Structure formats: structure tokens, C-alpha cells
């Protein structure tokens, strides 16, 4: 049982600071370097580097030097990520890994990665609790089947997750299709929810989307018209 | 240095997957392998070129030769789909070098293909000073969907945020991309296009102001 244990998630503002931990169990910390690895939403890992415990020799990255610190605490087997001058562009998975696999040859002289942390997410973004503006996605048959029309609401900028969708106070459930939230470089969510309704039926039943961002305290039940 | 990795790679359960790796005189080096599954933490699956570590199954099995290492799976399962990464250490440059990773999909069902629903901003929205395209995306298999937005005949960066695809109650696969613009950017263009493109093929909605 080789881990390292991560801190929680963190929401930070432009320009702040965040010092991430990544605590040893189950081994040696002073044995092994601890790298480190971020991956922004759906892109790769790039490397931030590595620091050796023993020493405590530091190795940054190219892309990373300058406004990012390694440290580490021997005493509590700890070590830290700390990221200065956050921008949205740094909103990302920050990992730490072990070390562990020794070179076997002096011509590749290189401690690679075997045991990885789970990550800390920190998302950068000038949002405080929001509640969404809600817009009316007004009906269209144009991607529907025959005698068919979508007709949506659109959640809009929103902070924290979540927010629910109903249809005419939960009347409606057949052909309602919520779609999850993006969350956008703001920091901020939308979501948008369409159901696909019989078209004669537009000018007889009224639809209502039952929008709830519980965080923000906010309902809003918007009628979407034809 | 740089590790250059296919994007996508598709098997159908039982078959072999080959993931590749290619990089100048990479194989002077010791190449590791990482998988990554949705939302996961990397986990080793190949370290030494070659070797792997405990409790890995043996179908995963890795070379590395010339100028390019490959990560093999034989007799793939759905659990392998997943991102997978070749690593080195760079000497000349003190940098650990990650390959932009492959996506395994691994084929459970037939090609589905993506229906497509692009509205408007509302006329509400654009009172309140701002102007929002909604593209839908539904019913599409595999899970994986590439989406371009173009206004009038040129393409548009900015301003554009796309989920990743997320299974639906009948097993397929649904995204959304919004696109925000200023009420002048809508307003003073012909028209705002949607491209989604799934498994080599593209369904384009357009709106316009009118």
C-alpha cells in the first residue's frame, strides 16, 4: 500500500495563489523523488517536475519555472505544489507521483513514475455562488421526426452544480432530454434541457421548464412559446 | 523532444490493440506506459519497454525499437478503454516528456451517428445584452465527437465551450457546445454554423438572424 494522499478541490480567483499537498504513506518518503503532472480538462498530462525529499533538489519544468514552487516538509513526509498568478488557463487536475522505478542502466539515469496521486482539482475563476438566467429555446422541428418539435430552456451562467430541470411541474417526463452542464472558462456553468413534444400540440399546451439552483436559492419556472 | 502518439485508436472486443509511440532514437530510451480511465488517476501498465508491473494482465505487452515503441493489448475488453500514454525522460533537456496520449475505444455496439439540434440566441437574451448558440448533440456512437463552429465562411475560436460526451438512458452518447457572442457579433454576420464531426463524417446546422 504505496499512496499518496492529495488535498481537496479548490475554486480560486485570477491572480491568487494555491499550495496543493501530497502526503507519503506505506513507504519511505525520503526514498523516492515526487513528481508532479497537470492535466487541464480534456488535454493531456504535461510535467510540472520533480523534487527529491532527501535532498531537497528541484528540477521545474520549462513551461512551469518561475511561477510555480516545489517545497517539501520531511518531517510529516509531505510535499507541496504551490501555483502563483492563477488565470483560467491553470483550472486543471494537479497530480503528484512516486518516483519509484529505478534506472536499470547508468546511460538512462532517470527515476520514473509507478504510483500516482488520485489529483487535486483547482478551477480558477471570478465566480461567487450565481443563479442562472434562464432563456426560452423557442420550438423547432427541423431535427425532430415527422409531426415533432423541440422546444428547450437554457440555463444560463450559473455557480455551484447544480441545477435541476422538470417539465410542467414533473407532468412531463416522455421525450425530455437534459443535457449536463458545461463548465466554461468564467468559471461558470450552463445547461440547457429540450423536450420533443407533438407540433399540433403547440398552440393548445403550455410548456414550462422547473428550473432550480438550490445553491443560489433561485427557482424559475419560464413558459416557452412558439 | 517530442513523443507522438495517435489520437484514436478503435478495436472491437477480442482483437488487438496497437498503441504507438514515436520519437527520435526512442528506443535508446526506457519507455513507460500509462492508462488513464474516465475521470481517473494514470496507473502503470507497461514500465521498461516491456515488463509489467503486479497485477497487470499479461495481454499487456509493450516493444519499443528504432524510432517508435508500441504498447500491444491483446484480447481487449470494454475495461481497457481508456487514454493511454507513453512517457520518457529527455536528457539533453532534464524533462520528463509525456505523449499527447491515445484514446482506446473499444466498439460494443454499432456506429451511431450524431443527431444534431442548433437554436438561436433568444430574443430575451439578446435584451439583456448577450447572445448565446445552443448545438445539441444526441444518439451518436462511439462516444467521441469533434466540434467546429464557423460564422459566415470562416471558422470561429472564440468563445466556444463543449462537454464531453455523456451516456444516455438507451446507451448512446449525448454533448452540447455553446458558442457565446456579443448581440453585434450575431447580429452582423449571415450566419453561425455548428459542425459536428463523429467517426469521419460531419452534420452542420445553421441559424441566422433573420
Known amino acids: 500500500q504505496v499512496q499518496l494522499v492529495q488535498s481537496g478541490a479548490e475554486v480560486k480567483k485570477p491572480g491568487a495563489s494555491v499550495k496543493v499537498s501530497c502526503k507519503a504513506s506505506?513507504?519511505?518518503?525520503?526514498?523516492?523523488?515526487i513528481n508532479w503532472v497537470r492535466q487541464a480538462p480534456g488535454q493531456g498530462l504535461e510535467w510540472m517536475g520533480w523534487?527529491?525529499?532527501?535532498?531537497?533538489?528541484?528540477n521545474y519544468a520549462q513551461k512551469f519555472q518561475g511561477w510555480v514552487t516545489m517545497t517539501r516538509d520531511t518531517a510529516i513526509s509531505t510535499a507541496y505544489m504551490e501555483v502563483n498568478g492563477l488565470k483560467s488557463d491553470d483550472t486543471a487536475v494537479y497530480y503528484c507521483?512516486?518516483?519509484?522505478?529505478?534506472?536499470?542502466?547508468?546511460?538512462?539515469?532517470?527515476?520514473?513514475?509507478?504510483?500516482w496521486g488520485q489529483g487535486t482539482t483547482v478551477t480558477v475563476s471570478s465566480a461567487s455562488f450565481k443563479g442562472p438566467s434562464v432563456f426560452p429555446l423557442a420550438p423547432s422541428s427541423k431535427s425532430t421526426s415527422g409531426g415533432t418539435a423541440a422546444l428547450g430552456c437554457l440555463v444560463k451562467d450559473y455557480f455551484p452544480e447544480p441545477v435541476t430541470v422538470s417539465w410542467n411541474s414533473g407532468a412531463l417526463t416522455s421525450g425530455v432530454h437534459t443535457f449536463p452542464a458545461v463548465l466554461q472558462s468564467s468559471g461558470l456553468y450552463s445547461l440547457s434541457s429540450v423536450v420533443t413534444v407533438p407540433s399540433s400540440s403547440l398552440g393548445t399546451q403550455t410548456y414550462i421548464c422547473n428550473v432550480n439552483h438550490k445553491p443560489s436559492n433561485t427557482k424559475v419556472d419560464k413558459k416557452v412559446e412558439p | 523532444s517530442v513523443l507522438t502518439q495517435p489520437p484514436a485508436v478503435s478495436v472491437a472486443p477480442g482483437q488487438t490493440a496497437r498503441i504507438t509511440c514515436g520519437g527520435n532514437?526512442?528506443?535508446?530510451?526506457?519507455v513507460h506506459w500509462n492508462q488513464q480511465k474516465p475521470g481517473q488517476a494514470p496507473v502503470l501498465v507497461v514500465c521498461?519497454?516491456?515488463d509489467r508491473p503486479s497485477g497487470i494482465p499479461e495481454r499487456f505487452s509493450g516493444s519499443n525499437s528504432g524510432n517508435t515503441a508500441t504498447l500491444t493489448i491483446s484480447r481487449v475488453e470494454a475495461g481497457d478503454e481508456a487514454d493511454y500514454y507513453c512517457?520518457?525522460?529527455?536528457?539533453?533537456?532534464?524533462?520528463?516528456?509525456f505523449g499527447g496520449g491515445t484514446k482506446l475505444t473499444v466498439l460494443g455496439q454499432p456506429k451511431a451517428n450524431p443527431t444534431v439540434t442548433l437554436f438561436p440566441p433568444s430574443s430575451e437574451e439578446l435584451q439583456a445584452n448577450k447572445a448565446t448558440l445552443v448545438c445539441l448533440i444526441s444518439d451518436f456512437y462511439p462516444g467521441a465527437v469533434t466540434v467546429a463552429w464557423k460564422a459566415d465562411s470562416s471558422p470561429v475560436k472564440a468563445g466556444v465551450e463543449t462537454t464531453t460526451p455523456s451516456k444516455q438512458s438507451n446507451n448512446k452518447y449525448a454533448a452540447s457546445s455553446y458558442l457565446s457572442l456579443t448581440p453585434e457579433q450575431w447580429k452582423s454576420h449571415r450566419s453561425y454554423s455548428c459542425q459536428v464531426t463523429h467517426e469521419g463524417s460531419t452534420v452542420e446546422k445553421t441559424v441566422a438572424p433573420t
Open positions: 523534487i527529491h525529499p532527501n535532498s531537497g533538489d528541484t
Open positions: 512517457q520518457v525522460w529527455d536528457s539533453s533537456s532534464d524533462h520528463v516528456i
Open positions: 532514437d526512442i528506443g535508446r530510451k526506457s
Open positions: 507521483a512516486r518516483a519509484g522505478l529505478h534506472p536499470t542502466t547508468t546511460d538512462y539515469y532517470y527515476y520514473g513514475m509507478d504510483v
Open positions: 506505506g513507504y519511505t518518503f525520503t526514498d523516492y523523488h
Open positions: 521498461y519497454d516491456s
